[PDB]
């Protein structure tokens, strides 16, 4: 009965393609004709942080938009005071291979994970002074790539086992596992309400998960190569995904199909990080060409370039107050742009 | 004008000094990478030195060697192979008892990240390989194989086939047999050559 179910799947795929096509009447690009362009923007490196010796792989901004976290292959996970470029903590790591970092919304905990297939959670407000490893989660058969905090008790991680998992830090078990992806996943972005997230896999298909129910709800496939990073629109109805084929794409979950694409003929380097701004007008996008590009999210046109990194930027993220954007490249340099 | 930010600045300076000291202390050791197919004897060579990545640390003639064995995890090679850049050399391991190894070597030697790192190539199971060669020729494995059915010719052909999978003259491949525990001396000689090359290049003289 394999042929019958295969034919049913093909027919249903044709039906969903027809439904998606029938829901499209006009592209966003021509609708955005009336919008005046944002114009060229110039961003200067207000602050530069110099405390790392190896390649920086990931970071996260604090909730108060003052505190940073750093993750590098040197084995050090430092927390920066962005305004005064100070160091408040320096947490050594058991394994020097680190691929992600996370900052808790409450500012109490910090998570980390890399090629050791284990997510480590540190308590930064211990009564005994220094920061210690509060918990240690090990339930994946592959490297972790992204970690995000729902609450102080829940963490969602993206690993190399082609699955996404939701943990309960109080006891450290698999509360819910998310299966369905056929490739490695290295993208995570939780919606502002923190009840729904989207992850980007290597099969050129980012899927829309559900934290409560535990099952996938929507599947978006418009890319051609692996997904390197994903971000969620501040509204919560759209999200942007950066792939390895040197292009970014803006999907919408309510319309459940493409809206616009961001590509340039001169750009050949693949995307590494993608983020938005407070209003969603600007789409910051890291590149492997040692620079970051600022795209007009509505006009699908380039607005400016923020260069100044010797090596490729492996991380990028704007502040919660939308006052600065921080980029960290492989040259162990973090720069704050305002 | 800092009221009590002076104490925070002092703490930051202490943290920076500690980080600099740790980096200086941790830059003296040399990092080596391990490759090869499943059950290729790389664990055997690691034991001869006496869950994703396993780390082995030893010392030999006042030089700390760190060995990274990665084959314990199954994932996409290119998804994490960039994390292993700047490694001094790649200690490839080949078992002469079983084309997958050739394909892996050809894919890893021409990688963009490893366009300059030296490759140390070890051929294992020499005795049983010789016994198998005396038992039967390797024409089944290599349909284009020509020559006698001796041991030296077969080993030379295998070494040439492995070594003919690179296109960068700047990258050198060292080859040796194994299975007196003196391969550590070979690794030390190769790493000293690599250190000399790196120092000369960094001095602007090479």
């Amino acid at each position, epitope marked *: 009965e394999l042929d019958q179910l295969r034919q049913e799947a093909e027919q249903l795929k044709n039906q969903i393609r027809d439904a998606r096509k029938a829901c499209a009447d006009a592209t966003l690009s021509q609708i955005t004709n009336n919008i005046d362009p944002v114009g060229r923007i110039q961003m200067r490196t207000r602050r530069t942080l110099r405390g790392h010796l190896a390649k920086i792989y990931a970071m996260h901004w604090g909730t108060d938009s003052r505190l940073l976290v750093s993750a590098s292959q040197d084995g050090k996970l430092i927390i920066w005071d962005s305004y005064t470029t100070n160091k408040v903590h320096a947490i050594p790591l058991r394994s020097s291979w680190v691929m992600t970092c996370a900052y808790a919304p409450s500012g109490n905990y910090v998570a980390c994970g890399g090629l050791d297939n284990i997510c480590s959670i540190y308590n930064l407000k211990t009564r005994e002074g220094n920061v210690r490893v509060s918990r240690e989660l090990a339930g994946h058969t592959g490297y972790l790539s992204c970690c995000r905090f729902l609450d102080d008790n829940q963490i969602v991680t993206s690993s190399g086992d082609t699955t996404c998992a939701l943990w309960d830090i109080e006891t450290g078990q698999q509360t819910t596992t998310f299966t369905g992806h056929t490739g490695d996943v290295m993208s995570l972005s939780l919606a502002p309400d923190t009840r729904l997230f989207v992850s980007g896999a290597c099969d050129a298909s980012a899927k829309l998960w559900d934290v409560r129910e535990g099952m996938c709800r929507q599947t978006f496939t418009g890319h051609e190569s692996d997904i390197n990073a994903i971000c969620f629109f501040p509204n919560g109805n759209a999200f942007a995904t950066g792939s390895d084929d040197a292009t970014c794409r803006l999907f919408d979950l309510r319309a459940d199909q493409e809206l616009m694409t961001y590509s340039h003929d001169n750009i050949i380097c693949g995307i590494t990080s993608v983020s938005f701004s407070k209003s969603g007008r600007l789409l910051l996008a890291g590149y492997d060409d040692f620079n970051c590009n600022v795209w007009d999210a509505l006009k699908a046109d380039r607005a400016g370039v923020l260069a100044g990194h010797d090596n490729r930027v492996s991380c990028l993220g704007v502040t919660d107050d939308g006052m600065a954007v921080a980029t960290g490249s492989w040259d162990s340099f973090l720069k704050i742009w305002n | 004008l800092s009221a009590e930010e002076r*104490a925070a600045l002092e703490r930051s300076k*202490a943290i920076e000094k500690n980080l600099k000291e740790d980096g200086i202390s941790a830059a003296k050791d040399v990092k080596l990478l391990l490759l090869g197919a499943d059950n290729s004897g790389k664990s055997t060579i690691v034991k001869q030195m006496k869950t994703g990545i396993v780390e082995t640390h030893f010392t030999f003639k006042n030089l700390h060697f760190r060995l990274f064995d990665v084959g314990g995890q199954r994932s996409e090679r290119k998804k994490w192979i960039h994390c292993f850049e700047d490694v001094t050399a790649i200690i490839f391991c080949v078992d002469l008892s079983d084309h997958e190894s050739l394909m892996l070597f050809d894919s890893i030697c021409n990688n963009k990240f490893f366009i300059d790192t030296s490759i140390i190539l070890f051929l294992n199971k020499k005795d049983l390989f010789g016994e198998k060669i005396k038992k039967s020729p390797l024409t089944i494995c290599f349909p284009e194989y020509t020559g006698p059915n001796t041991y030296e010719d077969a080993a030379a052909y295998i070494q040439a086939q492995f070594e003919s999978k690179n296109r960068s003259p700047n990258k050198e491949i060292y080859c040796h047999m194994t299975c007196d525990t003196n391969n550590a001396q070979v690794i030390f000689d190769a790493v000293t050559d690599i250190i000399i090359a790196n120092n000369l290049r960094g001095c602007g003289l090479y």
Partner: single-chain antibody
Amino acid sequence: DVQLVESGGGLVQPGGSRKLSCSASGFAFSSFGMHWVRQAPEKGLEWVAYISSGSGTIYYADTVKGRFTISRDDPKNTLFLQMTSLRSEDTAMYYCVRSIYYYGSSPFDFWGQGTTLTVSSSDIVMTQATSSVPVTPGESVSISCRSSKSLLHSNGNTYLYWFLQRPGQSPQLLIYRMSNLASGVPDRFSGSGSGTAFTLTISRLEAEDVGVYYCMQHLEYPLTFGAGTKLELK
């Protein structure tokens, strides 16, 4: 738990010498600045000395310069004070405290037990208007502390610390930066004020809150405490 006990006090002849050792166990002593605080038998707390992390900077009070010496020993995790040239006014009970500094830290969180010294026979001044008021349980009362200089720094946060000394034990930190509640403190405590007039407001007073309260200016050394506002039951 964190333990912080001092020893070395006793009877000292006028002009004699002594040593005070504050032994610490339970926390990373190598990264805490440590002060010494002196309290007269019938007066408020007074500052003595200070050391930084790694013995970087050493600070002293006005009337103490050149009198004693304070040192740190990280291997043994002990703070030392060199009791030298004890005058008639040096007789009091001494405390040792934790003073970790970083962005968001809470200095003076933990206070030592105390040792008694017995001897035979520009600075910011902070005044507390009231000295003692009755307070029935379940009522709301506010204590006031007024400074001399403006304690609101240019960086944004003003430095005002509120301490509570329960009768019979060491003082405990209540409020730091006059806006944040210390760890392990009930939410019924609150603090407010602006520039120079500060106040601490308590609601639903309980029997465990009777004591005396002190206000300290941490904007610049030396740190000056207050006379103290006393609360009494009924």
